[PDB]
Design a protein around this motif. Structure first.
Motif, PDB file in Angstrom:
ATOM      1  N   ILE A  55       0.901  -1.078   0.075  1.00 30.70           N
ATOM      2  CA  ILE A  55       0.071  -0.168   0.013  1.00 30.70           C
ATOM      3  C   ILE A  55       0.751   1.372  -0.035  1.00 30.70           C
ATOM      4  O   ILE A  55       0.670   2.284  -0.938  1.00 30.70           O
ATOM      5  N   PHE A  56       1.732   1.317   0.965  1.00 32.95           N
ATOM      6  CA  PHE A  56       2.423   2.839   1.136  1.00 32.95           C
ATOM      7  C   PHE A  56       3.765   2.723   0.171  1.00 32.95           C
ATOM      8  O   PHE A  56       4.326   3.758   0.063  1.00 32.95           O
ATOM      9  N   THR A  57       4.034   1.621  -0.732  1.00 38.45           N
ATOM     10  CA  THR A  57       4.930   2.017  -1.744  1.00 38.45           C
ATOM     11  C   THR A  57       4.390   2.315  -3.031  1.00 38.45           C
ATOM     12  O   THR A  57       4.946   2.609  -4.025  1.00 38.45           O
ATOM     13  N   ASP A  58       3.006   2.296  -3.140  1.00 35.65           N
ATOM     14  CA  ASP A  58       2.293   2.594  -4.202  1.00 35.65           C
ATOM     15  C   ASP A  58       2.242   4.171  -4.461  1.00 35.65           C
ATOM     16  O   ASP A  58       2.033   4.958  -3.407  1.00 35.65           O
ATOM     17  N   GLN A  59       2.498   4.609  -5.751  1.00 37.02           N
ATOM     18  CA  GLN A  59       2.759   5.794  -5.995  1.00 37.02           C
ATOM     19  C   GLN A  59       1.631   7.125  -5.653  1.00 37.02           C
ATOM     20  O   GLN A  59       1.925   8.138  -5.305  1.00 37.02           O
ATOM     21  N   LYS A  61      -1.168   5.627  -3.208  1.00 36.38           N
ATOM     22  CA  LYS A  61      -1.766   5.419  -1.923  1.00 36.38           C
ATOM     23  C   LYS A  61      -0.628   5.601  -0.871  1.00 36.38           C
ATOM     24  O   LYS A  61      -1.209   6.373   0.629  1.00 36.38           O
ATOM     25  N   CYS A  62       0.683   5.999  -1.153  1.00 33.73           N
ATOM     26  CA  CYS A  62       1.703   6.470  -0.210  1.00 33.73           C
ATOM     27  C   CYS A  62       1.426   7.738   0.407  1.00 33.73           C
ATOM     28  O   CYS A  62       1.716   7.942   1.377  1.00 33.73           O
ATOM     29  N   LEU A  64      -2.050   8.836   1.099  1.00 38.71           N
ATOM     30  CA  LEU A  64      -3.115   8.915   1.695  1.00 38.71           C
ATOM     31  C   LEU A  64      -3.047   9.052   3.317  1.00 38.71           C
ATOM     32  O   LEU A  64      -2.267   8.428   3.632  1.00 38.71           O
ATOM     33  N   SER A  65      -3.842   9.750   3.764  1.00 46.26           N
ATOM     34  CA  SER A  65      -3.810   9.972   5.502  1.00 46.26           C
ATOM     35  C   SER A  65      -4.679   8.796   5.929  1.00 46.26           C
ATOM     36  O   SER A  65      -4.531   8.771   7.329  1.00 46.26           O
ATOM     37  N   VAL A  66      -5.583   8.294   5.248  1.00 44.00           N
ATOM     38  CA  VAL A  66      -6.496   7.357   5.912  1.00 44.00           C
ATOM     39  C   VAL A  66      -6.644   6.267   4.723  1.00 44.00           C
ATOM     40  O   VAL A  66      -6.660   6.265   3.802  1.00 44.00           O
ATOM     41  N   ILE A  67      -6.659   4.982   5.589  1.00 40.51           N
ATOM     42  CA  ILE A  67      -6.596   3.540   4.733  1.00 40.51           C
ATOM     43  C   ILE A  67      -7.625   2.796   5.462  1.00 40.51           C
ATOM     44  O   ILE A  67      -7.848   2.797   6.796  1.00 40.51           O
ATOM     45  N   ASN A  68      -8.783   2.430   4.678  1.00 38.54           N
ATOM     46  CA  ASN A  68      -9.974   1.767   5.020  1.00 38.54           C
ATOM     47  C   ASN A  68      -9.665   0.233   4.821  1.00 38.54           C
ATOM     48  O   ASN A  68      -9.556  -0.330   3.597  1.00 38.54           O
ATOM     49  N   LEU A  69      -9.739  -0.458   5.852  1.00 40.16           N
ATOM     50  CA  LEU A  69      -9.579  -2.066   5.690  1.00 40.16           C
ATOM     51  C   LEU A  69     -11.091  -2.575   5.210  1.00 40.16           C
ATOM     52  O   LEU A  69     -11.826  -2.241   5.615  1.00 40.16           O
ATOM     53  N   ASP A  70     -10.693  -3.983   4.665  1.00 44.69           N
ATOM     54  CA  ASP A  70     -11.706  -4.846   4.239  1.00 44.69           C
ATOM     55  C   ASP A  70     -13.064  -4.875   5.371  1.00 44.69           C
ATOM     56  O   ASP A  70     -12.556  -5.131   6.409  1.00 44.69           O
TER      57      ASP A  70
ATOM     58  N   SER C  22      17.525   3.084   2.459  1.00 44.55           N
ATOM     59  CA  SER C  22      18.345   2.904   1.456  1.00 44.55           C
ATOM     60  C   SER C  22      17.920   3.151   0.361  1.00 44.55           C
ATOM     61  O   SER C  22      18.353   3.730  -0.820  1.00 44.55           O
ATOM     62  N   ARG C  23      16.448   2.848   0.114  1.00 42.27           N
ATOM     63  CA  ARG C  23      15.526   3.084  -1.195  1.00 42.27           C
ATOM     64  C   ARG C  23      15.115   4.602  -1.077  1.00 42.27           C
ATOM     65  O   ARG C  23      14.055   4.870  -2.198  1.00 42.27           O
ATOM     66  N   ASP C  24      15.036   5.292  -0.161  1.00 39.30           N
ATOM     67  CA  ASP C  24      14.672   6.664   0.003  1.00 39.30           C
ATOM     68  C   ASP C  24      13.096   6.710   0.213  1.00 39.30           C
ATOM     69  O   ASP C  24      12.481   7.480  -0.214  1.00 39.30           O
ATOM     70  N   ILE C  25      12.500   5.599   0.872  1.00 36.29           N
ATOM     71  CA  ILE C  25      11.035   5.344   0.883  1.00 36.29           C
ATOM     72  C   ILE C  25      10.595   5.997   2.195  1.00 36.29           C
ATOM     73  O   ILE C  25      11.069   5.628   3.297  1.00 36.29           O
ATOM     74  N   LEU C  26       9.576   7.092   2.081  1.00 29.42           N
ATOM     75  CA  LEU C  26       8.945   7.844   3.108  1.00 29.42           C
ATOM     76  C   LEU C  26       9.888   8.520   4.091  1.00 29.42           C
ATOM     77  O   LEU C  26       9.538   8.778   5.315  1.00 29.42           O
TER      78      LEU C  26
END
Ligand SMILES: N#Cc1c(Cl)ncnc1Nc1ccc2c(c1)CC(=O)N2
Ligand SMILES: N#Cc1c(Cl)ncnc1Nc1ccc2c(c1)CC(=O)N2
Ligand SMILES: [Cl-]
Ligand SMILES: [Cl-]
Ligand SMILES: [Cl-]
Ligand SMILES: [Cl-]
Lengths: 124, 4, 124, 4
Positions: A55-59, A61-62, A64-70, C22-26
């Motif tokens: 989710i947070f490596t997605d260009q 979704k990274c 977003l401040s809110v994530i809704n689970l299933d 290392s990957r400069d992520i977040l």
């Protein structure tokens, strides 16, 4: 290399990350699980969960401040796993094991899924 | 501290 | 409580935090040490350093994306300590010990200061 | 996993 290592460093870092979470310091996301909300640090979630890592490596979704689970995800199960992420301690009980395992499978937390399978098999 |  | 604990959890979290770095992520801050720049996660810095804990809990400084260290701070010393923060491994050598200790004192990293004092005393 |  010729490095020396401080045995307790990783544990002390995690203890401080949990203290920051408890005081809501630099938390950058809220995880919504039906009627419940959980504030956390994206980096910790990614470091513990295959689902959050994706989710947070997605260009998009990274950011977003809110994530809704299933909606099938149990809030107590999520809470137990979020506590595990920040402490290494899993509150596994007969009354919650099914919810914990289903939540760990969804979150892609293989070691938790493994101990849940083993605890279930021992009781059958 | 240890030698890892 | 009646929790079970996963021994390697804290170490695995730190390994993933280092992989993200290392990957400069977040990464959310750049630490400037004279001519050198180091990208990092504020939460990890706060979890390892009394100085960063103070800086990023400050109501104005918490929002800064750039932090400039004192010009007396050695970039190599800072680099060695930043690596220690993300790995628990300290590259302590005869050629860098004085810079590492002075940087650890400034950053308020008591355990590093302690091993530097001990290694120095053994050589006198 | 251990009993902490
Ligand atoms: N953050 C980060 C991260 C990185 Cl950078 N590299 C590799 N895995 C990462 N995290 C992550 C991925 C998959 C799973 C877990 C954590 C626990 C588990 O059972 N599956
Ligand atoms: N983040 C966070 C944090 C919290 Cl929440 N509580 C307490 N200490 C925190 N971090 C911190 C403060 C002082 C020092 C260190 C880390 C290492 C050291 O030698 N001194
Ligand atoms: Cl959002
Ligand atoms: Cl896990
Ligand atoms: Cl800035
Ligand atoms: Cl330290």
């Amino acid at each position: 290399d010729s490095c020396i290592q401080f045995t307790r460093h990783a544990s002390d870092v995690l203890l401080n990350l949990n203290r920051l979470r408890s005081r809501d310091i630099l938390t950058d996301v809220v995880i919504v699980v039906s009627r419940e909300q959980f504030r956390a640090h994206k980096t910790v979630l990614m470091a513990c969960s295959g689902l959050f890592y994706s989710i947070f490596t997605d260009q998009l979704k990274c950011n977003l401040s809110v994530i809704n689970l299933d909606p099938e995800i149990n809030p107590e199960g999520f809470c137990i796993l979020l506590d595990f992420m920040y402490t290494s301690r899993l509150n596994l009980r007969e009354g919650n094991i099914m919810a914990v395992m289903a939540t760990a499978m969804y979150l892609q937390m293989e070691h938790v899924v493994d101990t849940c399978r083993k605890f279930i098999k021992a009781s059958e | 501290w240890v030698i890892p």
